[PDB]
Design an enzyme around this catalytic site. Structure first.
Site, PDB file in Angstrom:
ATOM      1  N   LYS B  36       0.867  -1.243   0.000  1.00  0.00           N
ATOM      2  CA  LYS B  36       0.000   0.000   0.000  1.00  0.00           C
ATOM      3  C   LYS B  36       0.875   1.254   0.000  1.00  0.00           C
ATOM      4  O   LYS B  36       0.862   2.057   0.929  1.00  0.00           O
ATOM      5  CB  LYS B  36      -0.913   0.055   1.221  1.00  0.00           C
ATOM      6  CG  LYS B  36      -1.810  -1.155   1.377  1.00  0.00           C
ATOM      7  CD  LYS B  36      -2.951  -1.090   0.380  1.00  0.00           C
ATOM      8  CE  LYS B  36      -3.961  -2.274   0.646  1.00  0.00           C
ATOM      9  NZ  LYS B  36      -5.047  -2.246  -0.401  1.00  0.00           N
ATOM     10  N   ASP B 108     -10.804  -3.341  11.705  1.00  0.00           N
ATOM     11  CA  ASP B 108     -11.841  -4.253  11.307  1.00  0.00           C
ATOM     12  C   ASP B 108     -11.347  -5.700  11.530  1.00  0.00           C
ATOM     13  O   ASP B 108     -11.096  -6.433  10.584  1.00  0.00           O
ATOM     14  CB  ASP B 108     -12.301  -3.981   9.873  1.00  0.00           C
ATOM     15  CG  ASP B 108     -11.146  -3.831   8.863  1.00  0.00           C
ATOM     16  OD1 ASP B 108     -11.515  -3.604   7.693  1.00  0.00           O
ATOM     17  OD2 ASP B 108      -9.997  -3.860   9.167  1.00  0.00           O
ATOM     18  N   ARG B 211      -6.693  -4.071  -9.970  1.00  0.00           N
ATOM     19  CA  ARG B 211      -5.503  -3.350  -9.551  1.00  0.00           C
ATOM     20  C   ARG B 211      -4.387  -3.494 -10.609  1.00  0.00           C
ATOM     21  O   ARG B 211      -4.369  -4.502 -11.363  1.00  0.00           O
ATOM     22  CB  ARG B 211      -5.007  -4.042  -8.267  1.00  0.00           C
ATOM     23  CG  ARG B 211      -6.095  -3.875  -7.185  1.00  0.00           C
ATOM     24  CD  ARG B 211      -5.466  -4.359  -5.848  1.00  0.00           C
ATOM     25  NE  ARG B 211      -6.424  -4.284  -4.672  1.00  0.00           N
ATOM     26  CZ  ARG B 211      -6.505  -3.195  -3.902  1.00  0.00           C
ATOM     27  NH1 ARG B 211      -5.886  -2.064  -4.229  1.00  0.00           N
ATOM     28  NH2 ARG B 211      -7.364  -3.237  -2.874  1.00  0.00           N
ATOM     29  N   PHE B 304     -20.048 -20.436  -5.177  1.00  0.00           N
ATOM     30  CA  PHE B 304     -18.738 -21.070  -5.441  1.00  0.00           C
ATOM     31  C   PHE B 304     -18.094 -21.481  -4.125  1.00  0.00           C
ATOM     32  O   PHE B 304     -17.720 -22.639  -3.953  1.00  0.00           O
ATOM     33  CB  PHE B 304     -17.854 -20.141  -6.224  1.00  0.00           C
ATOM     34  CG  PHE B 304     -16.423 -20.639  -6.423  1.00  0.00           C
ATOM     35  CD1 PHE B 304     -16.123 -21.527  -7.447  1.00  0.00           C
ATOM     36  CD2 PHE B 304     -15.365 -20.183  -5.603  1.00  0.00           C
ATOM     37  CE1 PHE B 304     -14.796 -21.969  -7.618  1.00  0.00           C
ATOM     38  CE2 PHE B 304     -14.030 -20.641  -5.760  1.00  0.00           C
ATOM     39  CZ  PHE B 304     -13.747 -21.532  -6.781  1.00  0.00           C
ATOM     40  N   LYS B 305     -18.092 -20.572  -3.164  1.00  0.00           N
ATOM     41  CA  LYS B 305     -17.349 -20.840  -1.898  1.00  0.00           C
ATOM     42  C   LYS B 305     -18.043 -21.878  -1.013  1.00  0.00           C
ATOM     43  O   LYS B 305     -17.356 -22.592  -0.321  1.00  0.00           O
ATOM     44  CB  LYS B 305     -17.097 -19.527  -1.141  1.00  0.00           C
ATOM     45  CG  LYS B 305     -16.223 -18.600  -2.012  1.00  0.00           C
ATOM     46  CD  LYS B 305     -15.990 -17.288  -1.261  1.00  0.00           C
ATOM     47  CE  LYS B 305     -15.242 -16.345  -2.264  1.00  0.00           C
ATOM     48  NZ  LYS B 305     -14.816 -15.107  -1.575  1.00  0.00           N
ATOM     49  N   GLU B 319     -16.503  -2.731  11.216  1.00  0.00           N
ATOM     50  CA  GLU B 319     -15.528  -1.630  11.389  1.00  0.00           C
ATOM     51  C   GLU B 319     -15.700  -0.994  12.776  1.00  0.00           C
ATOM     52  O   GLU B 319     -16.843  -0.695  13.106  1.00  0.00           O
ATOM     53  CB  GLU B 319     -15.780  -0.584  10.287  1.00  0.00           C
ATOM     54  CG  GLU B 319     -15.373  -1.174   8.912  1.00  0.00           C
ATOM     55  CD  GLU B 319     -15.605  -0.286   7.723  1.00  0.00           C
ATOM     56  OE1 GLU B 319     -16.529   0.547   7.732  1.00  0.00           O
ATOM     57  OE2 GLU B 319     -14.850  -0.538   6.756  1.00  0.00           O
TER      58      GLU B 319
END
EC number: 2.3.2.10
Lengths: 5, 337
Positions: B36, B108, B211, B304-305, B319
């Site tokens: 980051k 979080d 990204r 899927f999971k 949070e």
């Protein structure tokens, strides 16, 4: 912005 | 104290705590600040009586359209956050280090939601964001709050991925391999390029944002081959799907993935099976497939999971915000009201 990470 | 990022001995002492803690998270490692690189790092810790680190919080500060920074400790802090008096002490250290530059310190942690822990945090002056912002969907919070996690400690004798599953699922896992899909792994530029081809293709296909390759190159540079591994599924030399998994603390986390268009011969299942195999071979407690939007057959991430995770999704506390500039907090953050 879109899964975080 | 605040960590001096220029003192390698201090930095190594902080890393050793992070790497060995049962509450360690890759997004709290100091290598996450290298990923980051557009955020500014501020890290703090507390020590016990003997001067050993007992708790640590890695923060990254981000710009906003106001004169204050957003301070964020992703999946931190690294300690038992339900020890709220100790959490307050570490947060007070973090707030001293921020030195009035941020409007909020948000963390979080991967700890289950409960009413008692939500109410405790609120009693202690934090603003929490969980079930009160759930109508806004998976992006109501920065990281998904519902996550699909496989607890491998329920299968102490499992030797292979298939040992964790009912026969109908064993069939689904065996299918790509029977059909010639083969999976290789490593953490070199070669596997990164194969991942990035499938990642940009999937992003175009789903119409989602993605990204740049440099994000993943900084991740490769920060994390060694025992921590970060890219798994690449091919059939007879044709690239089909890939995934990136990070081993840190008590979990191996399936973090990123891509797949080519049209028929992928169930290669995404072969990638899952090999990541699971890594978790078993390293006696890791948890395998985390990460977020979903809802526990619903309408949610394709859950469909899927749920092949791999038959337990209910973990629902985290969400949070936790230490509000430092309340005027800016009210401008920038909505409470779900």
């Amino acid at each position: 912005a879109x899964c975080x990470x | 104290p605040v960590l001096n990022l220029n003192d390698p001995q201090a930095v190594e002492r902080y890393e050793e705590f992070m790497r060995q803690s049962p509450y360690g998270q890759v997004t709290q490692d100091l290598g996450w600040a290298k990923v980051k690189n557009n955020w500014e790092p501020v890290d703090v810790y507390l020590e016990d009586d003997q001067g050993a680190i007992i708790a640590a919080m890695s923060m990254l500060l981000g710009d906003t359209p106001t004169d204050k920074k957003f301070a964020y400790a992703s999946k931190g802090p690294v300690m038992d956050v339900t020890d709220v008096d100790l959490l307050d002490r570490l947060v007070d250290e973090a707030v001293k280090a921020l030195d009035g530059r941020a409007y909020v310190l948000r963390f979080d942690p991967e700890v289950a939601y409960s009413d008692e822990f939500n109410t405790t945090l609120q009693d202690h002056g934090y603003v929490t964001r969980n079930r009160n912002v759930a109508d806004a969907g998976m992006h109501a919070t920065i990281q998904p709050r519902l996550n699909m996690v496989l607890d491998l400690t329920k299968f102490p004798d499992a030797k292979t991925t298939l040992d964790l599953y009912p026969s109908k699922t064993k069939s689904k896992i065996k299918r790509p391999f029977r059909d010639g899909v083969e999976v290789h792994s490593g953490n070199s530029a070669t596997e990164l390029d194969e991942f990035f081809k499938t990642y940009t293709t999937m992003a175009e296909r789903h119409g989602i944002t993605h990204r740049p390759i440099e994000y993943f190159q900084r991740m490769q540079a920060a994390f060694d081959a025992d921590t970060m591994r890219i798994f690449v599924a091919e059939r007879e030399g044709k690239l089909l799907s890939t995934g990136i998994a990070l081993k840190y603390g008590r979990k191996i986390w399936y973090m990123y993935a891509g797949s080519m268009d049209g028929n992928t011969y169930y290669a995404p299942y072969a990638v899952q099976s090999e990541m699971i195999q890594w978790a078993l071979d390293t006696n890791t407690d948890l395998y985390d497939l990460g977020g979903i939007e809802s526990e619903s057959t309408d949610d394709s991430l859950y469909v899927f999971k749920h092949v791999f995770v038959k337990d209910a999704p973990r629902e985290y506390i969400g949070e936790i915000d230490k509000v430092l500039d309340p005027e800016v907090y009210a401008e920038l953050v909505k409470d779900g009201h």
